[PDB]
């Protein structure tokens, strides 16, 4: 058995699955969605364990949906701030504060690919995401497959 804090501290596909069949609800339940920065952190930690394998892919996608639905459905949640901070932590947009960009964008891009296809996703954010995913960047260039996939999906939003 596992717990949410342990998973977030040291993310792994195995720990996500060990959270149980209700892992998606637990991730959202234990995340303070009133804070954009914390939602960005949870989103990236969860997406960091994405693997193109049935059980893991479903677990990551479900977790992202539970988390983002909860965050986006708060009329007070600033979705623009979320997008901005997400881009900063992904190393695609500069910031005034110091942040060490994540090393691998594979999971985050695949998680985003799924997220933008859901009803809870604010379509107004699509153009901004598209702008920064198409913009030149070495991290993205090394994640070509995931990057192309996300862009093709964004064209359909």
């Amino acid at each position: 058995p596992a717990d949410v804090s342990t998973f977030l501290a040291f993310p792994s596909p195995e720990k996500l699955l060990r959270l149980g069949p209700k892992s998606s609800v637990l991730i959202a339940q234990q995340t303070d969605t009133s804070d954009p920065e914390k939602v960005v952190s949870a989103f990236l930690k969860v997406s960091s364990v994405f693997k193109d394998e049935a059980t893991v892919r479903m677990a990551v996608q479900d977790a992202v949906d539970a988390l983002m639905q909860k965050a986006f459905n708060s009329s007070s949640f600033n979705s623009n701030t979320f997008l901005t901070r997400l881009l900063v932590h992904m190393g695609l947009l500069k910031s005034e504060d110091k942040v060490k960009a994540i090393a691998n964008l594979y999971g985050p891009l695949m998680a985003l690919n799924h997220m933008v296809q859901q009803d809870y996703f604010p379509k107004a954010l699509a153009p901004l995401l598209l702008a920064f995913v198409t913009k030149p960047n070495s991290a993205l260039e090394s994640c070509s497959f995931a990057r192309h996939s996300l862009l093709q999906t964004l064209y359909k939003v």
Binding site: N80, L83, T84, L93, K94, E96, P127, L128, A131, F132
Partner: protein, 157 residues
């Protein structure tokens, strides 16, 4: 221990008062006791004639650190402006305003204000400070210029 910064700023004030570009404003704020606060200046930059920024007067604050001129001042538009190189916080980005880039202890306030004025109609889009303006600039140039004109009219003195 701001003595060196204050010595330099007192001279910059004298120089600016003797001669500065027409339409521009740069004046030290006042402390509660009535004396000058040379570390915090209230400035204003006029939009360039012949550009979509014409007619507007854009207010900004210049903040100097105790180690100035080893470090550049922090310049922030108040209120924040719609522009690819202006953070949502209002902070303006320019190579001459970055200690690790083109800032040199010798750079003057006049050079900075003129540099920012130049930046207004000639945005360096390579590394944007905000996702909103960058996105619009890249996806619909006419719409971008339309928002710039509206903003210039809004801040017309």
């Amino acid at each position: 221990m701001s003595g060196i910064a204050l010595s330099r700023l007192a001279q910059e004030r004298k120089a600016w008062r003797k001669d500065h570009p027409f339409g521009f404003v740069a004046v030290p704020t006042k402390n509660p006791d009535g004396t000058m606060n040379l570390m915090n200046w209230e400035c204003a930059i006029p939009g360039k004639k012949g550009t979509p920024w014409e007619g507007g007067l854009f207010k900004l604050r210049m903040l100097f650190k105790d180690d100035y001129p080893s470090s550049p001042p922090k310049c922030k538009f108040e209120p924040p402006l719609f522009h690819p190189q202006v953070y949502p916080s209002g902070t303006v980005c320019l190579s001459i305003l970055e200690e690790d880039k083109d800032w040199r202890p010798a750079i003057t306030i006049k050079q900075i204000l003129l540099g920012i004025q130049e930046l207004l109609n000639e945005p360096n889009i390579q590394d944007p400070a905000q996702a909103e303006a960058y996105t619009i600039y890249c996806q619909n140039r006419v719409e971008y210029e339309k928002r710039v004109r509206a903003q210039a009219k809004k801040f017309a003195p």
